[PDB]
């Protein structure tokens, strides 16, 4: 037992981290097969960030201007192209450590692991969630750009995020591995305010199920509710609306614990209305929303 | 910016995880050089757990009774010995993925990363702290025994913990890599209650410094205190006493933020006495104590 904010083991992704330098800017790149993926803003200088014309800035760059270093050895760049907000640098050597992989674009509410890197070197790994406003609450300093988000299913790494920027509010924005930003963010130093960071209701319910499985049952009550009644309360507290799809996704957890999904919704409703009263659930004094129902099942069953 | 419960990248430790089977029990082992380390309770059956005589149980085991599998290939066991509560199985092949390593016995309050494994396969990584009562609040299911705790300094892995058991209260006990348990716990299925889980004061202060560095400053007040006054309050709230050694360890964070350690203690004192009032610090509604002052500096500086 015990429930922890757990990340996927990062080895498979560590073997893919490289350093990409263009001029004076150095950031992280992801080396899969003979391609290195990195944020296109690696070609930008001090001025450029404010109003960059990437197509124009890219004309002044040749293959030899992109310095790619994997460990302490240099990779030869034989081609370069821009796909949306990522640069793809074709190298002459396939990464011998390329795991089986996919590029996926996740939905908000979905969780993933981030391997935070600096100068192509991994510094740490943590578990994130794509917020409903398409930001991520990460831990990224200057030079962390190019660090990636991923999920692993046995031996296949599904890359879903690449770090590009920090908004003035200390939250983070990035793209999928096709270079498309999550949300409305752009890779320029301009006024970009995030929308309402609503709570991922289905994840809170999944984590309440994890708490019951682990023995924290004080919040379980004698009440039930309906999806419509629950959602009136959820709207009031800036919680995402709960749909029949979410109820279905929670089915295995409801089955394992014997607590009907709507009964857990009524417990969540009373927690929203009354607060925790100084109590904790799974060692937390707030309702945790960065565990999906899949994460709860995986962690509670020991999927390797 | 942003502050996350960050683990060390786990690749170097993933390359060391093996499966050890003795009879019907299968748990995890750590393969460094030509030795595989695992909990000695791998030799125990259903009955044995209650009152095991490990020296007697070990007499009935030969090298061929220990099945060690690294990936899908079997390792040949050429020697076996018991060192305290760990078994050391000498194999005929040195692990080609052995990183530079050390075995360290950490103090309570110190943090570390755990790579939770099942059948020698890594399932997840998370950051822990050795509690002042010598337990760890992990996430471990049956078969997780032999999973290890570690810290990394650039390229050297310092292994500090090996998982052995879960106490009836859902908390975890284990040993260092020399087989010595942390705390008074023993590897037998008996009444073993944990002591008071006090809060690691120096870690809470380090995390309050991390919050100031990241912009969460609402809790900063106009007060100061002394080590003796602060400690009277700390004792009342089951916080560990703060010593001059802890104040010295917080020096770099005090220097970076310009907030004297005793001033941060007075802020912590008011948080203990008044509570959070429904507010959060670094996205948490309670005072976090699983970040050491070294972790705060490492994360805030991007040590790779
Ligand atoms: C690796 C790049 C980097 O450190 N950062 C960055 C990103 C960019 C552009 C060209 C805008 C994509 O330029 N520098 C920064 C970052 O995003 N800083 C930043 C913060 C706030 C604002 O407000 C307008 C603009 C910018 C540029 C970074 C720092 C920490 C974490 N991630 C990224
Ligand atoms: C990998 C071994 C295992 O799953 N567990 C275990 C440990 C042991 C001994 C021989 C006692 C060291 O036997 N089985 C269990 C575990 O420790 N279970 C457990 C819980 C509570 C009590 O109370 C008396 C006794 C025992 C044996 C395990 C389960 C989950 C996480 N870690 C370990």
From Swiss-Prot, chains A, B:
Residues 1-304 are cytoplasmic. Residues 1-304 form the Peptidase C30 domain. The active site is at residues 41, 145. It is found in: Host cytoplasm; Host Golgi apparatus; Host nucleus. Inhibited by pyridone-containing alpha-ketoamides compounds 13a and 13b. In turn, alpha-ketoamide 13b (tert-butyl (1-((S)-1-(((S)-4-(benzylamino)-3,4-dioxo-1-((S)-2-oxopyrrolidin-3-yl)butan-2-yl)amino)-3-cyclopropyl-1-oxopropan-2-yl)-2-oxo-1,2-dihydropyridin-3-yl)carbamate) inhibits SARS-CoV-2 replication in human lung cells. Inhibited ex vivo by michael acceptor inhibitor N3. Inhibited ex vivo by compound 11a and 11b. It comes from the Viruses. There is a cross-link at residues 5, 90 (Glycyl lysine isopeptide (Lys-Gly) (interchain with G-Cter in ubiquitin)). Changing residue 145 to A: Complete loss of 3C-like proteinase nsp5 cleavage. Changing residue 90 to R: In strain: Beta/B.1.351. It catalyses: TSAVLQ-|-SGFRK-NH2 and SGVTFQ-|-GKFKK the two peptides corresponding to the two self-cleavage sites of the SARS 3C-like proteinase are the two most reactive peptide substrates. The enzyme exhibits a strong preference for substrates containing Gln at P1 position and Leu at P2 position. 3CL-PRO exists as monomer and homodimer. Only the homodimer shows catalytic activity. Interacts with host FBXO22; this interaction promotes the proteasomal degradation of nsp5. Cleaves the C-terminus of replicase polyprotein at 11 sites. Recognizes substrates containing the core sequence [ILMVF]-Q-|-[SGACN]. Cleaves and inactivates human TRMT1, preventing tRNA guanine(26)-dimethylation of tRNAs. May cleave human NLRP1 in lung epithelial cells, thereby activating the NLRP1 inflammasome pathway. May cleave human GSDMD, triggering alternative GSDME-mediated epithelial cell death upon activation of the NLRP1 inflammasome, which may enhance the release interleukins 1B, 6, 16 and 18. Also able to bind an ADP-ribose-1''-phosphate (ADRP). This is 3C-like proteinase nsp5. The lineage of its organism: Viruses, Riboviria, Orthornavirae, Pisuviricota, Pisoniviricetes. The chain holds residues 3264 to 3567 of 7096 of the full protein.
